[PDB]
């Protein structure tokens, strides 16, 4: 009768498989600047905003015209192998990427068709900026927990190639301001990549990592969004951390890893300081891969696994602040 | 221990409120043709494809530059009034429209900000072509059923104005084929409008309509998709109807209303004939409103309510065939 935080946690949802794809083509910030230099000089800016402001030394791009669905498909094939199961076991496939093939059909239906899902497989896309992979995990988790399905795929492929092309062109244009130039530099922190996760009812995969679920808080009053964005973002994260304490029983020091979506080096710096987090428990790929949007979290989790910096029983925080503003925080126990 | 179809149905999820918005501006197919006539003649086509092929006499457009989020917001305000509850009760807001304000943030976060949702309110978009409102209902239903929330908004605003403008321009172009002209005529069956639904835990709204849930089947092998589309669509719907029999206990004759997404008059005709459905139990707005995409189903349900052609105990089938291909069928008991 009496509600407790732990009541809303999932008891029988696990991570059966997990994979990521690193996009092959390394584009250094060194090169981008060589191309921007006549516009840096021309604008009188001695600031390497990319290398030691945003703190990005390189990002990965695709080598060819890879569609979001292609990248998600490749990651999904890898995750199925990791889980050691055939596509026929999948009852749900959710796509969570920002990158999108078409207006319709859903990117999820395209990935599903590529993989050869059965006619029982439910598919749809979830869109929520940088937090959507966590949303997709949670949505799949509720179907698993309820027993509507036994296995689910959550996939996310991101391509920034066209953005980089369109963006590099507008910033080397003659009639471009220092405002625009700055307003567009942000696109140049984005990276390509993909990730997929197979989730399953725990009894089908004894001893697999457990997904407990998590909490979300929002500040949609700020959906219009600068230092203001960092300040409101941190304030939202503070209140989300209170919710996490109330549901997950989180204390910053009892967590073993923080898998955090990253916007820039100084953003992550401000967050880590605000919460008193030990920076050693925060793996970062932003410096060499840039911001891979909603794929960032599972890619980092996947890299931790393969490295392999994870041990059974480890408490792993998954979190991010997304446009909205929204903030989500969820726990995996390895 | 032993699974039964009825087990996966929701027992404590109801529809607390429901509203629709009719877009104000009537554009008759008469007018569109007056503008297309020099291209009909020029192409030697005596075929009024719109009026007595697709069977659309008129569709509604917006009078001004209405964004999806604006239309969804207006419908949501109306649904809250219908449910007699303040926005502060809402723990989840899902947007399901095809029309989309920006790449980010989600359209849902924009609507939420407009309405003034509390910081506890979770938001995200679901994208799945014409079936997404049903997906959003189901996603909200699982959170309600589980007790994670007490009230949810599912909203959907559609705007076709720009499509109609871009489309009318390409079909009155000199160098346009009869193929292209036909390949684009389809955009001219789309209409504008909006709908929103407040869902709630049944005990909070005794005697409100009950949402039971439903089933989905897919044929993602056909995600590339003509008479072929109709044939595969009907075949998919046949198998989805078997699933509905197995879960919902559906027999065509025991249903009181069929709320069906509509692509065109001959499409709906073929469907109704294939299933032996009494056409009198199928309200249609396509002739005067066109195809409002994923908003079509809740708009028709909302019009049935206000008319009011619904009585307590009525078994109401919600269904559609969407790009993917996917097909979903769910039941509401009024
Ligand atoms: C630590 C403070 C964070 C400020 C918030 C920035 C928004 C981040 C982005 O714009 C993208 O990286 C992802 C997103 N918005 O969902
Ligand atoms: C009855 C047979 C239906 C054929 C399927 C057509 C696809 C319909 C559409 O293209 C849109 O109206 C909605 C959608 N695809 O989700
Ligand atoms: Mn290369
Ligand atoms: Mn373990
Ligand atoms: Mn008008
Ligand atoms: Mn009743
Ligand atoms: Xe895993
Ligand atoms: Xe945290
Ligand atoms: Xe209702
Ligand atoms: Xe049906």
Brief descriptors of the model:
homodimer; 334 residues; alpha/beta; Peroxisomal Thiolase, Chain A, domain 1; five-stranded mixed sheet; four-stranded mixed sheet; 11 helices; 22% strand; binds (2S, 3R)-3-hydroxy-4-OXO-7,10-trans,trans-dodecadienamide; binds manganese (II) ion; binds xenon
**CATH architecture classification name of the largest domain in chain A:** 3-Layer(aba) Sandwich
How many extended strands of chain A?
11
In the CATH hierarchy, the third-tier topology of the largest domain in chain A is known as Peroxisomal Thiolase, Chain A, domain 1
Shape of chain A: globular
Describe the model.
Chains A, B: It is an enzyme of class 2 (transferase). Two copies of one chain form a homodimer. The first copy, chain A, has 334 residues and is an alpha/beta fold. Chain A has two domains: 1-205, 3-Layer(aba) Sandwich (Peroxisomal Thiolase, Chain A, domain 1), CATH 3.40.47.10; 206-334, Thiolase/Chalcone synthase (Peroxisomal Thiolase, Chain A, domain 1), CATH 3.40.47.10. Helices cover 37% and strands 22% of the residues of chain A. Chain A has eleven helices and eleven strands. In chain A, helix 3 crosses helix 4 (107-115). The radius of gyration of chain A is 20 Å and the shape is globular. Strand 5 of chain A pairs antiparallel with strand 5 of chain B. One xenon binds next to strand 1 of chain A.
Helices and strands in order, then pairings?
The structure is a homodimer of 334-residue chains.
Chain A (H helix, E strand, L loop, with lengths): L12 E10 L2 E4 H12 L8 H6 L3 E4 L6 H16 L8 E4 L11 H9 L6 E6 L4 H15 L4 E8 L2 H10 L7 H8 L7 E9 L8 E9 L8 H22 L8 E4 L4 H11 L10 H4 L6 H12 L7 E8 L3 E8 L1
Parallel strand pairs in A: 4-5, 4-6, 9-10
Antiparallel strand pairs in A: 1-7, 2-3, 6-7, 8-11, 10-11
Helix pairs in contact in A: 3-4
The site of one (2S, 3R)-3-hydroxy-4-OXO-7,10-trans,trans-dodecadienamide (CER) has 14 residues of chain B, from α8, α9 and β10.
PDB class: transferase
Keywords: Non-decarboxylative Claisen Condensation Reaction, transferase
Assembly: dimeric
């Amino acid at each position: 009768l009496v509600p407790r935080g732990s009541h809303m946690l999932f008891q029988n949802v696990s991570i059966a498989g997990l994979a990521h794809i690193d996009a092959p083509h390394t584009l250094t910030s060194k090169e981008i600047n060589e191309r921007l230099q006549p516009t840096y000089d021309r604008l009188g800016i001695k600031t390497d905003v990319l290398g030691d402001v945003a703190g990005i030394h390189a990002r990965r791009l695709w080598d060819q015209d890879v569609q979001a669905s292609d990248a998600a498909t490749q990651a999904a094939r890898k995750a199925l192998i990791d889980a050691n199961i055939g596509i026929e076991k999948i009852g749900l496939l959710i796509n969570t990427s920002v990158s999108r093939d078409y207006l319709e059909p859903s990117t999820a239906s395209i990935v599903s068709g590529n993989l050869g899902v059965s006619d029982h497989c439910m598919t749809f896309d979830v869109a929520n900026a940088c937090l959507a992979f966590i949303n997709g995990m949670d949505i799949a988790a509720r179907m698993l927990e309820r027993g509507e399905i036994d296995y689910a795929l959550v996939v996310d492929g991101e391509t920034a190639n066209l953005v980089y092309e369109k963006t590099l062109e507008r910033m080397t244009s003659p009639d471009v301001t220092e405002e625009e130039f700055r307003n567009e530099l942000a696109a140049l922190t984005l990276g390509c990549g993909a990730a997929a996760m197979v989730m399953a009812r725990s009894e089908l995969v004894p001893d697999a990592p457990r997904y407990k679920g998590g909490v979300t808080r929002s500040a949609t009053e700020w959906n219009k969004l600068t230092r203001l964005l960092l300040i409101e973002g941190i304030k939202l994260a503070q209140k989300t951390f209170v919710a996490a304490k109330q549901v997950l029983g989180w204390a910053v020091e009892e967590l073993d890893q923080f898998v955090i979506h990253q916007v820039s080096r100084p953003h992550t710096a401000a967050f880590v300081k605000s919460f008193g987090i030990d920076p050693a428990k925060v793996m970062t790929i932003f410096g060499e891969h840039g911001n891979i949007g909603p794929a960032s979290v599972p890619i980092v989790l996947s890299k931790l696994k393969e490295l392999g910096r994870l041990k059974k029983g480890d408490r792993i925080a998954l979190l991010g602040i997304g446009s909205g503003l929204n903030c989500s925080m969820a726990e995996v126990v390895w």
